[PDB]
């Protein structure tokens, strides 16, 4: 994944998730993508209520992108792998 500053364009399924979280732009930095992904998970309350580093994304469009039913914020590889599949570097 590109560093800080580099601009990326998300593929449509990911862009849609970011738009749900309030994103109005079409071009992002990776950190901005991560901001809106966190916003989305928070707004949709996909985090486990008792162990909140666990995200339950099954039965949500986010899980179709991540290809896993749950993940840990402390084990973010599925997130990064998804971003590599879904970000076009500009």
């Amino acid at each position: 994944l590109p560093g800080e500053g580099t601009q990326v364009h998300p593929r449509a399924p990911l862009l849609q998730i970011l738009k749900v979280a309030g994103a109005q732009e079409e071009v992002f930095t990776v950190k901005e993508v991560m901001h809106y992904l966190g916003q989305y998970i928070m707004m949709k309350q996909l985090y486990d209520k008792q162990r909140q580093h666990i995200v339950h994304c099954h039965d949500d469009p986010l899980g179709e992108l991540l290809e896993v039913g749950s993940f840990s914020v402390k084990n973010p590889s599925p997130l990064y792998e998804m971003l590599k599949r879904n970000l076009v570097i500009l």
């Binding site: 950190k31 901001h35 966190g38 928070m42 909140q52 580093h53 914020v73």
Partner: peptide, 14 residues
């Protein structure tokens, strides 16, 4: 007892 919002911000900035 950390919240999701604090946990994700740590990820985001790391």
């Amino acid at each position: 007892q950390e919240t999701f919002x604090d946990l994700w911000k740590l990820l985001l900035e790391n």
